[PDB]
Amino acid sequence: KGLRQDSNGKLRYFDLTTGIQAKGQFVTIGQETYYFSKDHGDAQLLPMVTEGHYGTITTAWVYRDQNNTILKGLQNINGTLQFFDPYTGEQLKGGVAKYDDKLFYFESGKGNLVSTVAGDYQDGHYISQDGQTRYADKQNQLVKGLVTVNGALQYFDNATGNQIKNQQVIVDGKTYYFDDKGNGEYLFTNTLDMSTNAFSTKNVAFNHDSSSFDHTVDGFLTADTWYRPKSILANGTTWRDSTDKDMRPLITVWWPNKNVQVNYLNFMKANGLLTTAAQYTLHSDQYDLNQAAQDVQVAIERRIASEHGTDWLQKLLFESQNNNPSFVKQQFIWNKDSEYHGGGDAWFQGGYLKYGNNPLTPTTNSDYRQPGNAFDFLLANDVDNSNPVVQAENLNWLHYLMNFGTITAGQDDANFDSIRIDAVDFIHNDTIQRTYDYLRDAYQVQQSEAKANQHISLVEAGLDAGTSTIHNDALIESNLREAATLSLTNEPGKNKPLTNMLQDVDGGTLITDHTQNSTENQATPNYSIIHAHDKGVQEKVGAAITDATGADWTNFTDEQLKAGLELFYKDQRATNKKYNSYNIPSIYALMLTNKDTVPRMYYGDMYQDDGQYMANKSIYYDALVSLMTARKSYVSGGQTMSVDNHGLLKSVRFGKDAMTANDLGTSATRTEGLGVIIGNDPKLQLNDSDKVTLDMGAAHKNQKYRAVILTTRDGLATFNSDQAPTAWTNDQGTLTFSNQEINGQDNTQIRGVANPQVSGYLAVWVPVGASDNQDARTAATTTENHDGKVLHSNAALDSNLIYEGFSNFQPKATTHDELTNVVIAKNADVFNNWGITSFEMAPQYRSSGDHTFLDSTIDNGYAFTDRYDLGFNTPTKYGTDGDLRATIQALHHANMQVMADVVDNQVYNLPGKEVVSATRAGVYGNDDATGFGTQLYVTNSVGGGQYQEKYAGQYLEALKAKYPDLFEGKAYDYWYKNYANDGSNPYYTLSHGDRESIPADVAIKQWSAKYMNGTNVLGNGMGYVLKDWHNGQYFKLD
């Protein structure tokens, strides 16, 4: 058998196991690779091409020889068969070429020849028939089997002609994947059958007990597994019964596919264990591959004897040799290539794996894992917030945070008062609804504005957070940030008109209208920002790093951050800004004077990260101080806003108790109210007769005004007392400006300017004569609410002001006194004096430090393992637990409430391993259609830490006794955002929820996969948990 000469001297081949003649295929025998004809089966020697190197031409691959000439057609290169266009010599990858008047497929990875294709079709058409898709050829006949259709590899079931979509399929000993559109790719070539010989039978496992195998997880075997065989070939010579000390690697005796087996033989050859000129390819006869593996095993046993051990073998197969990835990691099925990272729905970390169920994984299965919101995955280990036990644990943690001082040191003035729900749209609605009911039970926020306004909570979303807007349990983000991004933050010539600032609209739904706002309790309670720790900041700091160093987020060091931050602030301080927003003061002037919003100041707009906390003031500092100071003293009453014929935005507040322009107001009103004039065109010039007006209203006739902000040539002049330039209203309450100075006072004229602080125009005007302690704010009342809403947008809510008190890119403290939390406490009275009523602290959880995302590289507190560790023993980035308690006390003693950033979405760096069923998925929690399919997967899912062990579940029995309502099932409503098909505006419908009852007697002392929805991709591959790929059956120990 094998290669046999016929009666006319011609060569033919017969498969060494089956005896079938080779026709229309390639076969590697000895050192040589032959083709055998599809007609008579006549051999053809394909010359081995060694030397040369892979090339480029204008943009594709070729291969050039020893004499630098470009090779064409079929080529036998170092044990692979490749095809190069017969004219340009451009390498074919992922397609078919004709040879011997039939079709062969060359895979998309390396262009290797891997299989036969039945036909290639261009002229047929798809049909829908008996509930299926099929393909009919040019004679209207159904096409069957593995084919190409219009250049795409596809498969149609042989019996029916039904097209296969979203499945892995075995065709003639090769495994492919066909995506959601039926488009195909090669995965691997299968092994035929294992050596049934006496040698192989000695290699069978001693038994199926766990003591016979290692590197196992939950009873499953992995690529790293070593095992005890029945017998051992001691010394390379003598079969003996194995002992309990004999262990050998499973991948010396068994391979998941042919590609791995061939790669193994060649690797071993290259490292001394096989001496031969024989070539091992995908076209080698399986018999010869099986035999050569046995010869490798002989040589291993000889070396095990010489070395008195297996430590050399551990290294050879499983560790990086010469900077190269290990043998295991070189294989497709054991690396990230078989996980198909990325895609549009893979927002971070290369995308996600979603957990499912499997009969063999009872300890990781779940009856839950529904997203219950519009998004699901984002980062790291995604917490299943639909799970009843997890929802209880969320109440436990919330309780812990809201009583942190009481619990850790008996200090009742050192507890958080409100929350931020981080990544709200990525957690199940039941947990959000239940969280709001907790705040209701604990603080009676629903009773009146006086209770609600003591606990002003917020979420990271707009109107889409339907559980947050249905009863206005928390503030949503207004559309101001997005609107200002269109009309103010861009360079000259890239801003839209300011008419987009007149209404606050979220996908066509009105949040509040500024044009003529004389009402109260109409607007959706909201916060307005321009920047945040993660809104409009990273991307720009990243561009700065790159011009500065060459690095970016995927590779940057601590020195490179510092270098990037130097360039960042240098840019920020110039007129012409390569990376920074324009018109920041003007945007803050809008934020701080608009009616029906609670503004939130960002730390980073006031201070610079090229210094320690609060050390370096930003260029915008004086202007934002001046704006906060004037808001406290003057801003109350109604609003009007319009854009005039010169493009200038004119905004007026009338002052306390004046809702309209025609309101005569009361005696408090006369010295309150203000006027704001903004332009976004730095070349604005008025003619000599043009006027710009502010209609201050009927309470402000014949009245002197004074500047708070004026645009100057170089920047902005700021004034915090009545010693400033002045101007007078006429008998209707109108202020009138022009291109002339008023009474010779510099910077009172209207004109476009370009400087570091403004690109267009900014002025702010307040009535003269306020007392030194005038406070235009409105106190909350104890009056009972009757409309079902927790928060109401009115003068009292408008009187609050939030401070986001951190940045991602702040540096590490070098001393106690530099720690953020120690500096905050010391500066408490500064915040109170600015009118901050809510201090939003960073998340205080200890960072995982694992560098798998930005959060765990600059250690901001969003990426943690132990969510109860708030700086016990050694500090977080911001301080120790004792510092945190002192900060909360200091803020409370300066009349602020303090907000806890509650991060229910994920947990990082859980070192303990488990096995779970997994499929590729995106942020929406939709199954992606990838070659990974659905595989059992070794996840990093078990852990938590010392404070979770100490505190998780500890308060549940007492919470159930005090607020039993929280542990019951409950019916509820919420708004749901729908996207229209025809590209018109999203629209809101009312959804119904029914949360489940939850238990008080199961604690989550450590995370594990049964409490998780999934994980970011880990790079182990589609086949690191071992199975028989012929029938799909996992190896599992009993």
Ligand X SMILES: OC[C@H]1O[C@H](OC[C@H]2O[C@H](O)[C@H](O)[C@@H](O)[C@@H]2O)[C@H](O)[C@@H](O)[C@@H]1O
Ligand Y SMILES: OC[C@H]1O[C@H](O)[C@H](O)[C@@H](O)[C@@H]1O
What binding mask, one character per residue, do residues 111-150 give for ligand X by CB under 6 A, x or -?
x---------------------------------------
Residue 558 marked in a binding site:
no
Q: How far apart are CA 284 and CA 64, in angstroms?
A: 26
Pick from Na ion, Ca ion, ligand Y, none: which does 1 bind, CB < 5 to 8 A by kind?
none
Pick from ligand Y, ligand X, Ca ion, none: which does 111 bind, CB < 5 to 8 A by kind?
ligand X
Judged by CB, which is closer to ligand Y: 162, or 948? 162
CB atoms within 10 A of CB 8: 7
CB atoms within 10 A of CB 958: 11
Pick from ligand X, Na ion, ligand Y, none: which does 415 bind, CB < 5 to 8 A by kind?
Na ion
Interface with ligand X (CB under 6 A), residue from 25, 33, 76, 91: 91
Judged by CB, which is closer to ligand X: 332, or 868? 332
Q: How far apart are CA 224 and CA 241, in angstroms?
A: 24
Examine residue 49 and tell whether it contacts ligand X (CB under 6 A).
Answer: no
Judged by CB, which is closer to ligand Y: 149, or 802? 149
CB atoms within 10 A of CB 204: 12
**Residue 499: DSSP 8-state:** G
Comparing CA positions, the residue from 798, 1020, 1034 lying closest to residue 224 is 1020
Examine residue 402 and tell whether it contacts Na ion (CB under 5 A).
Answer: yes
Interface with ligand X (CB under 6 A), residue from 110, 816, 950, 962: 110
Helices (H), 920-1007: 946-951, 956-962
Interface with ligand X (CB under 6 A), residue from 14, 61, 348, 621: 61
Selected range binding Na ion among 288-296, 408-416, 629-637, 693-701, rule: CB under 5 A: 408-416
Pick from Ca ion, ligand Y, ligand X, none: which does 110 bind, CB < 5 to 8 A by kind?
ligand X
Beta bridge partners of 1027: 1034
Interface with Ca ion (CB under 5 A), residue from 416, 426, 864, 1011: 426
Judged by CB, which is closer to Na ion: 352, or 404? 404
Helix axis angle for 286-307 and 258-270, nearest 10°, is: 40
Q: Which residues sit directly before a break in the chain (C to N > 2.5 Å)?
A: 58
Sequence-separated (6 or more) residues with CB below 8 Å from residue 440 = 446, 790
* Total binding residues toward ligand X, as defined by CB under 6 A: 6
Look at the block and give the residue holding tokens 């903004």. 678
Q: What 3-state class would DSSP assign to 458?
A: strand
Q: How far apart are CA 907 and CA 560, in angstroms?
A: 28
Sequence-separated (6 or more) residues with CB below 8 Å from residue 702 = 728, 729, 730, 731
> Shortest approach of ligand Y to residue 928 CB, angstroms?
18
Judged by CB, which is closer to ligand Y: 124, or 525? 124
Examine residue 415 and tell whether it contacts Na ion (CB under 5 A).
Answer: yes
Pick from Ca ion, ligand Y, Na ion, none: which does 163 bind, CB < 5 to 8 A by kind?
ligand Y
* Total binding residues toward Ca ion, as defined by CB under 5 A: 3
Examine residue 382 and tell whether it contacts Ca ion (CB under 5 A).
Answer: yes
Judged by CB, which is closer to Na ion: 399, or 1010? 399
Sequence-separated (6 or more) residues with CB below 8 Å from residue 273 = 296, 299, 300, 303
Give the footprint of ligand Y on residues 144-183 (CB under 6 A).
163, 181-182
Judged by CB, which is closer to Ca ion: 382, or 504? 382
Pick from Na ion, ligand X, ligand Y, none: which does 583 bind, CB < 5 to 8 A by kind?
none
**CB-based contact 946:866 (threshold 8 Å):** yes
Judged by CB, which is closer to ligand Y: 180, or 547? 180
Judged by CB, which is closer to Ca ion: 226, or 426? 426
Q: 167-171 and 60-64 as β-strands: parallel, antiparallel, unpaired?
A: unpaired
Judged by CB, which is closer to Na ion: 190, or 457? 457
Q: How far apart are CA 739 and CA 755, in angstroms?
A: 19
Tokens of 254: 């068994």
Residue 426 marked in a binding site:
yes
* Total binding residues toward ligand Y, as defined by CB under 6 A: 5
Helices (H), 30-124: none
Examine residue 898 and tell whether it contacts Na ion (CB under 5 A).
Answer: no
Q: How far apart are CA 348 and CA 341, in angstroms?
A: 10
Examine residue 1024 and tell whether it contacts Ca ion (CB under 5 A).
Answer: no
Selected range binding Na ion among 414-422, 521-529, 694-702, 960-968, rule: CB under 5 A: 414-422
Residue closest to Na ion (Cβ): 415
Tokens of 62: 């070729």
Examine residue 133 and tell whether it contacts ligand Y (CB under 6 A).
Answer: yes
Residue closest to ligand Y (Cβ): 182
Phi then psi dihedrals of residue 565, to 5 deg: -70, -35
Q: How far apart are CA 656 and CA 665, in angstroms?
A: 8
Residue 377 marked in a binding site:
no
Selected range binding ligand X among 107-115, 798-806, 811-819, 860-868, rule: CB under 6 A: 107-115
Comparing CA positions, the residue from 381, 249, 289 lying closest to residue 916 is 381
Judged by CB, which is closer to ligand X: 861, or 1023? 1023
Examine residue 715 and tell whether it contacts ligand Y (CB under 6 A).
Answer: no
Comparing CA positions, the residue from 956, 972, 918, 968 lying closest to residue 369 is 918
> Shortest approach of ligand Y to residue 127 CB, angstroms?
9
Q: How far apart are CA 205 and CA 212, in angstroms?
A: 8
> Shortest approach of ligand X to residue 167 CB, angstroms?
23
Pick from ligand Y, Ca ion, Na ion, none: which does 426 bind, CB < 5 to 8 A by kind?
Ca ion
Selected range binding ligand X among 109-117, 767-775, 897-905, 998-1006, rule: CB under 6 A: 109-117
Helix (H) or strand (E) holding 248: strand 248-249
Comparing CA positions, the residue from 803, 740, 264 lying closest to residue 532 is 803
Give the footprint of ligand X on residues 578-637 (CB under 6 A).
none
Amino acid occupying residue 621: Y
Judged by CB, which is closer to ligand Y: 121, or 932? 121
Examine residue 88 and tell whether it contacts ligand X (CB under 6 A).
Answer: no
Tokens of 642: 């319009």
**CB-based contact 436:974 (threshold 8 Å):** no
What binding mask, one character per residue, do residues 503-542 give for ligand X by CB under 6 A, x or -?
----------------------------------------
> Shortest approach of Na ion to residue 454 CB, angstroms?
9
Give the footprint of ligand Y on residues 93-132 (CB under 6 A).
126
Q: What is the dihedral of CA 493, 494, 498, 499, to 10 degrees?
A: 110
Q: How far apart are CA 304 and CA 308, in angstroms?
A: 6
Q: 838-840 and 906-907 as β-strands: parallel, antiparallel, unpaired?
A: unpaired
Residue 376 marked in a binding site:
yes
Phi then psi dihedrals of residue 889, to 5 deg: -65, -45
Judged by CB, which is closer to Na ion: 455, or 650? 455
> Shortest approach of ligand Y to residue 165 CB, angstroms?
7
Interface with ligand X (CB under 6 A), residue from 51, 54, 367, 1001: 54
Side-chain-side CA neighbours of 917 within 13 Å: the count stands at 15
Pick from Na ion, ligand Y, Ca ion, none: which does 726 bind, CB < 5 to 8 A by kind?
none
Judged by CB, which is closer to ligand X: 106, or 569? 106
Query: For the chain, what is the total number of helices (H) and then of strands (E)?
Result: 22, 56
Sequence-separated (6 or more) residues with CB below 8 Å from residue 85 = 72, 91, 92
> Shortest approach of Na ion to residue 381 CB, angstroms?
29
CA distances from 72 to 26, 58, 82, 96, 536 (A): 19, 17, 10, 15, 52
> Which residues form the interface with Ca ion (CB under 5 A)?
382, 426, 905
Give contact residues for ligand Y (rule: CB under 6 A): 126, 133, 163, 181-182
Where is the binding site for Ca(2+), in residues? 376, 382, 426, 905
The residue ranges that bind ligand X (CB under 6 A) are 54, 61, 91, 109-111
Enumerate binding residues for Na ion (CB under 5 A).
402, 415
- Residue ranges for the binding site? 376, 382, 426, 905
